[PDB]
Amino acid sequence: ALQIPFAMQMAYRFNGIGVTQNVLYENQKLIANQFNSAIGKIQDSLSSTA
Amino acid sequence: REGVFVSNGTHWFVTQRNFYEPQIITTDNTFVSGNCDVVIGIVNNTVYDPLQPELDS
Ligand SMILES: *[C@@H]1O[C@H](CO)[C@@H](O)[C@H](O)[C@H]1NC(C)=O
Numbered sequence A: 001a002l003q004i005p006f007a008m009q010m011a012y013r014f015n016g017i018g019v020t021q022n023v024l025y026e027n028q029k030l031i032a033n034q035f036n037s038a039i040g041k042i043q044d045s046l047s048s049t050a
Numbered sequence B: 001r002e003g004v005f006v007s008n009g010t011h012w013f014v015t016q017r018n019f020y021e022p023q024i025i026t027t028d029n030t031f032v033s034g035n036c037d038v039v040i041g042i043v044n045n046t047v048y049d050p051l052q053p054e055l056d057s
Protein backbone atom coordinates (compact mmCIF):
# COMPACT_ATOMS: atom_id res chain seq x y z
CA ALA A 1 0.00 0.00 0.00
CA LEU A 2 1.47 3.37 -1.11
CA GLN A 3 -0.12 6.36 0.64
CA ILE A 4 -1.55 9.18 -1.54
CA PRO A 5 -3.77 12.18 -0.54
CA PHE A 6 -7.44 11.37 -1.26
CA ALA A 7 -8.02 14.47 -3.45
CA MET A 8 -5.03 13.37 -5.62
CA GLN A 9 -6.34 9.79 -5.79
CA MET A 10 -9.66 11.17 -7.07
CA ALA A 11 -7.76 13.30 -9.63
CA TYR A 12 -6.09 10.06 -10.89
CA ARG A 13 -9.55 8.35 -11.02
CA PHE A 14 -10.99 11.33 -13.00
CA ASN A 15 -7.94 11.21 -15.32
CA GLY A 16 -8.71 7.46 -15.79
CA ILE A 17 -12.23 8.23 -17.23
CA GLY A 18 -10.85 10.83 -19.72
CA VAL A 19 -11.71 13.92 -17.58
CA THR A 20 -8.63 16.14 -17.03
CA GLN A 21 -7.16 16.46 -13.46
CA ASN A 22 -7.93 20.20 -13.14
CA VAL A 23 -11.69 19.42 -13.45
CA LEU A 24 -11.50 17.77 -10.01
CA TYR A 25 -9.22 20.29 -8.26
CA GLU A 26 -11.23 23.30 -9.55
CA ASN A 27 -14.52 21.61 -8.41
CA GLN A 28 -13.28 19.68 -5.33
CA LYS A 29 -15.81 21.15 -2.82
CA LEU A 30 -18.74 20.42 -5.18
CA ILE A 31 -17.45 16.86 -5.90
CA ALA A 32 -17.05 16.19 -2.14
CA ASN A 33 -20.57 17.59 -1.40
CA GLN A 34 -22.13 15.45 -4.19
CA PHE A 35 -20.35 12.37 -2.76
CA ASN A 36 -21.26 13.09 0.91
CA SER A 37 -24.89 13.70 -0.18
CA ALA A 38 -24.98 10.51 -2.32
CA ILE A 39 -23.90 8.28 0.64
CA GLY A 40 -26.62 10.08 2.69
CA LYS A 41 -29.17 8.89 0.05
CA ILE A 42 -27.85 5.28 0.38
CA GLN A 43 -28.18 5.37 4.19
CA ASP A 44 -31.72 6.86 3.93
CA SER A 45 -32.74 4.29 1.23
CA LEU A 46 -31.60 1.26 3.30
CA SER A 47 -33.05 2.85 6.50
CA SER A 48 -36.43 3.49 4.75
CA THR A 49 -37.16 0.04 3.17
CA ALA A 50 -36.55 -3.71 3.70
CA ARG B 1 0.49 16.14 -17.89
CA GLU B 2 1.30 12.44 -17.28
CA GLY B 3 2.96 12.36 -13.81
CA VAL B 4 2.61 13.55 -10.19
CA PHE B 5 4.35 16.47 -8.38
CA VAL B 6 6.83 15.53 -5.66
CA SER B 7 9.47 17.12 -3.40
CA ASN B 8 12.68 15.75 -1.86
CA GLY B 9 12.28 18.38 0.96
CA THR B 10 14.17 21.27 -0.79
CA HIS B 11 13.31 20.94 -4.54
CA TRP B 12 10.12 20.25 -6.54
CA PHE B 13 9.97 17.68 -9.36
CA VAL B 14 7.45 15.84 -11.54
CA THR B 15 7.68 12.00 -11.67
CA GLN B 16 5.83 9.22 -13.49
CA ARG B 17 3.39 7.63 -10.98
CA ASN B 18 4.68 3.99 -10.82
CA PHE B 19 8.50 4.49 -10.72
CA TYR B 20 10.60 7.28 -9.17
CA GLU B 21 12.23 9.06 -12.10
CA PRO B 22 12.17 12.78 -11.10
CA GLN B 23 12.36 15.56 -13.70
CA ILE B 24 12.48 19.39 -13.61
CA ILE B 25 9.02 21.03 -13.66
CA THR B 26 8.59 22.66 -17.12
CA THR B 27 5.95 24.13 -19.48
CA ASP B 28 6.36 20.87 -21.52
CA ASN B 29 5.83 18.53 -18.49
CA THR B 30 2.76 20.53 -17.23
CA PHE B 31 -0.47 22.24 -18.41
CA VAL B 32 -2.18 25.38 -17.01
CA SER B 33 -5.73 25.83 -15.82
CA GLY B 34 -6.85 29.12 -14.21
CA ASN B 35 -5.56 31.19 -11.26
CA CYS B 36 -4.10 29.79 -7.99
CA ASP B 37 -7.07 30.54 -5.68
CA VAL B 38 -9.49 27.77 -6.88
CA VAL B 39 -7.27 24.83 -5.77
CA ILE B 40 -6.90 23.37 -2.23
CA GLY B 41 -3.20 22.77 -1.34
CA ILE B 42 -1.48 24.39 -4.38
CA VAL B 43 2.20 25.40 -3.68
CA ASN B 44 4.45 28.16 -5.07
CA ASN B 45 7.36 27.07 -7.32
CA THR B 46 9.24 28.06 -10.50
CA VAL B 47 8.17 26.32 -13.74
CA TYR B 48 11.06 26.30 -16.25
CA ASP B 49 10.28 27.45 -19.83
CA PRO B 50 12.52 25.81 -22.52
CA LEU B 51 12.12 28.82 -24.89
CA GLN B 52 13.83 31.28 -22.43
CA PRO B 53 17.45 30.13 -23.27
CA GLU B 54 16.61 30.69 -26.97
CA LEU B 55 15.27 34.22 -26.15
CA ASP B 56 18.60 34.70 -24.25
CA SER B 57 20.51 34.42 -27.62
C1 LIG C 1 16.88 17.75 -3.70
O1 LIG C 1 17.30 17.64 -5.10
C2 LIG C 1 18.34 18.60 -5.55
C3 LIG C 1 18.71 18.34 -7.01
O2 LIG C 1 19.15 16.98 -7.18
C4 LIG C 1 19.55 18.52 -4.61
O3 LIG C 1 20.48 19.58 -4.93
C5 LIG C 1 19.13 18.72 -3.15
O4 LIG C 1 20.31 18.62 -2.31
C6 LIG C 1 18.11 17.64 -2.77
N1 LIG C 1 17.71 17.81 -1.37
C7 LIG C 1 17.77 16.84 -0.47
C8 LIG C 1 17.20 17.16 0.91
O5 LIG C 1 18.27 15.75 -0.74
Ligand SMILES: *[C@@H]1O[C@H](CO)[C@@H](O)[C@H](O)[C@H]1NC(C)=O
Residues within 6 Å of the ligand: B040, B041, B042
Ligand atom coordinates in the same frame (compact mmCIF):
# COMPACT_ATOMS: atom_id res chain seq x y z
C1 LIG D 1 -2.67 18.69 5.81
O1 LIG D 1 -3.16 18.36 7.14
C2 LIG D 1 -2.91 19.39 8.17
C3 LIG D 1 -3.38 18.85 9.53
O2 LIG D 1 -4.81 18.66 9.53
C4 LIG D 1 -3.60 20.70 7.75
O3 LIG D 1 -3.20 21.76 8.64
C5 LIG D 1 -3.20 21.13 6.33
O4 LIG D 1 -4.02 22.27 5.96
C6 LIG D 1 -3.37 19.99 5.32
N1 LIG D 1 -2.81 20.40 4.03
C7 LIG D 1 -3.56 20.97 3.09
C8 LIG D 1 -3.00 20.91 1.67
O5 LIG D 1 -4.63 21.51 3.37
Ligand SMILES: *[C@@H]1O[C@H](CO)[C@@H](O)[C@H](O)[C@H]1NC(C)=O
Residues within 6 Å of the ligand: B043, B044
Ligand atom coordinates in the same frame (compact mmCIF):
# COMPACT_ATOMS: atom_id res chain seq x y z
C1 LIG E 1 2.43 32.08 -2.84
O1 LIG E 1 2.84 33.34 -3.46
C2 LIG E 1 1.87 34.45 -3.32
C3 LIG E 1 2.42 35.66 -4.10
O2 LIG E 1 3.81 35.87 -3.76
C4 LIG E 1 1.63 34.71 -1.83
O3 LIG E 1 0.60 35.71 -1.66
C5 LIG E 1 1.15 33.43 -1.14
O4 LIG E 1 0.95 33.70 0.28
C6 LIG E 1 2.16 32.29 -1.33
N1 LIG E 1 1.64 31.06 -0.73
C7 LIG E 1 2.25 30.40 0.25
C8 LIG E 1 1.58 29.10 0.72
O5 LIG E 1 3.30 30.80 0.75
